[PDB]
Design a protein around this nucleic acid. Structure first.
Length: 88
RNA sequence: AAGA
């Protein structure tokens, strides 16, 4: 599953890119105050779900990234995550 | 789900 992991990784890094975050109000409203989102929320997004429903594979894809960081079941952008959360 |  290494090729599939790479596509998943890059898709999720797009969601956490500054360019996306500047317009992604839904994602920002779902963040906690520290920027964290449930990984299973990201797994539901259409372009990730198309690729896989394997949660281990999604976690493995994210562990490979220098854009995001995982803590338990949650993920956030590594750089300045606190700037992005928004009121629900 | 205008790549939530």
């Amino acid at each position: 599953q290494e090729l599939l992991k790479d596509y998943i990784k890059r898709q999720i890094e797009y969601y956490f890119s500054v360019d996306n975050l500047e317009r992604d109000f839904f994602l920002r409203r779902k963040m906690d105050a520290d920027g964290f989102l449930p990984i299973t929320l990201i797994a539901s997004f259409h372009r990730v779900q198309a690729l896989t429903t394997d949660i281990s594979l999604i976690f493995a894809a994210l562990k490979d990234s220098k854009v995001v960081e995982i803590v338990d079941e949650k993920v956030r952008r590594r750089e300045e995550p606190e700037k992005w959360p928004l009121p629900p």
